[PDB]
């Protein structure tokens, strides 16, 4: 167990002790244990702290702010993650300077202490969000082994959606999260139900779950209705995920998805399921989602009336879990050669076992697909295509003094058609990879793999100018419209965003903020709203779209596009330094950019930053 999760029984025990002590403190309890600093968060058992009253969504969900959590999103697709609003408000309320939580975190950071976030019930959920906050504020800025956090939760509700889990996987952060769940514990299942389904019964169940509230008399009816509603919505979510994961029946699934309201919350991080005799660790979020349903069923038909009460009592059974940790059999489900025994001890039916096996096989498929992609991008014929473009086509076009953009665009020689052939083959391969990414058929880590980011960036920088030339060569700017608006292949947008995320995420800023800060840094004097209006769908956001902007700027009067001109000029040097734009090309005598640049008014050219890089018109 310890060589997989990276935490031992000592840390689990201390985390449980701190979680218990947190019941008696304001907001949080700090426990200093030599080299370890444990932050335990006070749990809450009011419905307000599970479904925010002012939240108007069916599951109390809210999108994260892309500024404060730039990594919690899909990179290529852009979609930001969604979390439970009540838990986010509770974390926000504890990060509040008056609580000394942040000051203590920074004191432990400067002291290179091992920081541990923990909590029971919803407090553990806060710990999960605090860990993400920590990962965004501290760990991503300087990833040391001393700075690595640990998140340990006990019976925590679900917090994020599928994008949340995917982003955690891509950043290699999932390994830090361990969520202990007693087999029947209802609390991890609560947020899988529609809020209208439990609006009447939630306060009573929360009152029964509070360990310090032995006042409200237990009611059989309310608990049974609650259990039935939660299991019904959970079954609907799990069956839809089952039908969607295997890619079959996509038409009827898409139509019902338009007409079905299913909880978005998904397991994030490692889950450890516990019984009297077994500890079963599971990593695959889909498998955990299925197990949250199929492990909480009755064996006989006589126990169906009993399960809801055991599902309540099991939330207060974590003391026994922690005390009997070393006496239980452990196994790693994902690494097992046979999973029948483990799931049989967890009461998982045959069908639930087949769904778990299918989820694991789907993850193995994604891994195989990634192995195939690595083999492809490491083959000689593939790297040779890029080498040929870089070392033969570009120098020959530079020797003709017009550049390889203009040479491709006019395509007067056989070499231009050969470059077009290799451009089409590369386009097909990267579109096929993009297709796999869109269907979630690659591992979560794929977009974070530095070898892939390197290759895709080299590809984008080399060949996107050629796809822009192909676009304008066939007059698609007049038929379809501006390249930046309706023409840009999605594969290049994915490559750009993957590269930007890779290089920007250690500094906590997002690409848009950097861009607009440079725009205001160019001292144009115009109103920021007006400039954002002018630079809407501008080609100046990506160096490999340099030529697209030239196409959009040539032909227009100078006054009409003066701002976009000075913007394009202000981005050029970093683009050249970073290798996004080749300095041996764009300044050639026969280059479209140079030919258009000379026709600009002499008043601009005189005080233009590019005057010293091209001879004047004499």
């Amino acid at each position, epitope marked *: 167990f310890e060589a997989l999760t990276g935490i031992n029984g000592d840390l689990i025990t201390r985390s449980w002790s701190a979680s218990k002590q947190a019941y008696l403190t304001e907001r949080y309890h700090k426990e200093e244990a030599g080299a370890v600093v444990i932050f335990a968060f006070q749990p809450s058992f009011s419905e307000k702290d599970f479904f925010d009253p002012d939240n108007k969504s069916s599951f109390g969900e*809210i*999108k*994260l*702010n892309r*500024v404060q959590f730039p990594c919690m999103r899909k990179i290529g697709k852009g979609d930001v993650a969604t979390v439970n*609003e009540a838990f*986010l408000k509770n*974390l926000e309320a504890v990060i*509040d300077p008056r609580t000394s939580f942040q000051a203590s975190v920074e004191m432990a950071v400067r002291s290179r202490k091992q920081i541990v976030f923990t909590g029971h019930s919803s407090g553990g959920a806060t710990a999960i969000l605090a860990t993400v906050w920590y990962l965004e504020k501290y760990f991503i800025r300087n990833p040391n082994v001393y700075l690595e956090p640990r998140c340990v939760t006990f019976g925590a509700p679900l917090v994020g959606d599928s994008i949340f889990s995917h982003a955690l996987g891509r950043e290699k952060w999932s390994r830090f999260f361990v969520n202990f769940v007693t087999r029947f514990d209802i609390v991890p299942r609560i947020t899988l139900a529609r809020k209208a389904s439990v609006e009447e019964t939630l306060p009573h169940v929360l009152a029964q779950l509070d360990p310090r509230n032995s006042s409200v008399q237990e009611s059989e009816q309310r608990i049974t209705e609650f259990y039935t509603s939660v299991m019904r919505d959970t079954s609907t979510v799990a069956n839809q995920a089952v039908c969607e994961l295997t890619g079959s029946a996509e038409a009827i699934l898409e139509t019902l998805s338009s007409f079905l309201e299913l909880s978005p919350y998904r397991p994030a991080g490692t889950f450890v399921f516990s019984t009297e005799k077994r500890l079963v660790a599971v990593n695959n979020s889909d498998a955990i989602l299925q197990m949250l349903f199929y492990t909480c069923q009755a064996s006989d038909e006589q126990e169906w009336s009993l399960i809801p009460f055991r599902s309540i009592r099991d939330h207060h059974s974590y003391e026994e879990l922690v005390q009997s940790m070393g006496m239980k059999l452990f196994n790693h489900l994902d690494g097992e050669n046979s999973i029948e025994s483990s799931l049989n001890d967890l009461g998982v039916s045959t069908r639930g076992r087949q769904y778990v096996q299918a989820a694991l096989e789907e993850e193995k498929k994604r891994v195989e697909n990634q192995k195939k992609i690595i083999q492809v991008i490491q083959q000689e014929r593939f790297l040779k295509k890029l080498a040929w473009i870089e070392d033969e086509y570009k120098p020959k076009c530079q020797a003709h003094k017009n550049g390889y953009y203009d040479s491709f665009k006019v395509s007067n020689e056989e070499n231009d058609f050969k470059a077009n052939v290799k451009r089409a083959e590369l386009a097909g391969v990267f579109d096929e990879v993009l297709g796999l990414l869109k269907k979630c058929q690659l591992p979560d880590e794929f977009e974070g793999d530095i070898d892939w980011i390197k290759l895709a960036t080299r590809y984008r920088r080399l060949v996107e100018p050629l796809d822009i030339a192909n676009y304008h060569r066939h007059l698609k700017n007049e038929d379809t419209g501006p390249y930046m608006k309706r023409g840009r292949p999605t594969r290049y947008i994915y490559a750009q965003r993957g590269y930007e995320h890779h290089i920007l995420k250690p500094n906590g800023m997002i690409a848009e903020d950097v861009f607009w800060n440079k725009v205001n840094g160019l001292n144009l004097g115009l109103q920021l709203e007006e400039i954002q209006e002018t630079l809407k769908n501008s080609g100046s956001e990506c160096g490999s779209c340099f030529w697209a902007e030239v196409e959009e700027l040539k032909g227009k009067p100078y006054e009409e596009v003066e701002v976009r001109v000075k913007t394009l000029e202000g981005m050029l040097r970093e683009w050249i330094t970073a290798g996004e734009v080749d300095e041996k090309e764009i300044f050639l005598e026969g280059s479209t950019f140079r030919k258009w640049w000379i026709t600009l008014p002499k008043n601009h050219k005189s005080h233009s930053p590019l005057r010293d890089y091209m001879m004047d018109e004499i």
Partner: nanobody, 116 residues
Framework: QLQESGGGLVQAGGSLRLSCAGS????????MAWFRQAPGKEREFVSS????????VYRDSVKGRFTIARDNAANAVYLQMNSLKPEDTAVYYC???????????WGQGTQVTVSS
């Protein structure tokens, strides 16, 4: 724990100052914003302060007439409303919220009536 104040009744061209104060450490870690709810009309966005950053963008009907300001010492928000329009009669609310896409810490709001 967000509360507004400063709503009154004045005709066109009036100068008003709406104040918005909270009980938690809000100021520059929650990016402020002002919305207005007109009777029947949507809660149309008025403006927003980008918390610590001085970035701020009003929308059309206001630019150069309603200023927005923050106060970290008093953790308050100040909406100056000069050259009022009879079409500005609405319930003004201040919303401050971060870690999220859309804001969701709303107050009680205050009525602002402009006649002719």
């Amino acid at each position: 724990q967000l509360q507004e104040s400063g709503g009154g009744l004045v005709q066109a061209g009036g100068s008003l100052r709406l104040s918005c104060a909270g009980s938690g450490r809000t100021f520059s870690t929650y990016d402020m914003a002002w919305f207005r709810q007109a009777p029947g009309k949507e809660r149309e966005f008025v403006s927003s302060i980008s918390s610590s950053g001085g970035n701020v963008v009003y929308r059309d009907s206001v630019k150069g007439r309603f200023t927005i300001a923050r106060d970290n010492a008093a953790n308050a928000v100040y909406l100056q409303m000069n050259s009022l329009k009879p079409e500005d009669t609405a319930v003004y609310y201040c919303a401050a919220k971060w870690l999220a896409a859309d804001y969701n810490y709303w107050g009680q709001g205050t009525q602002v009536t402009v006649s002719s």
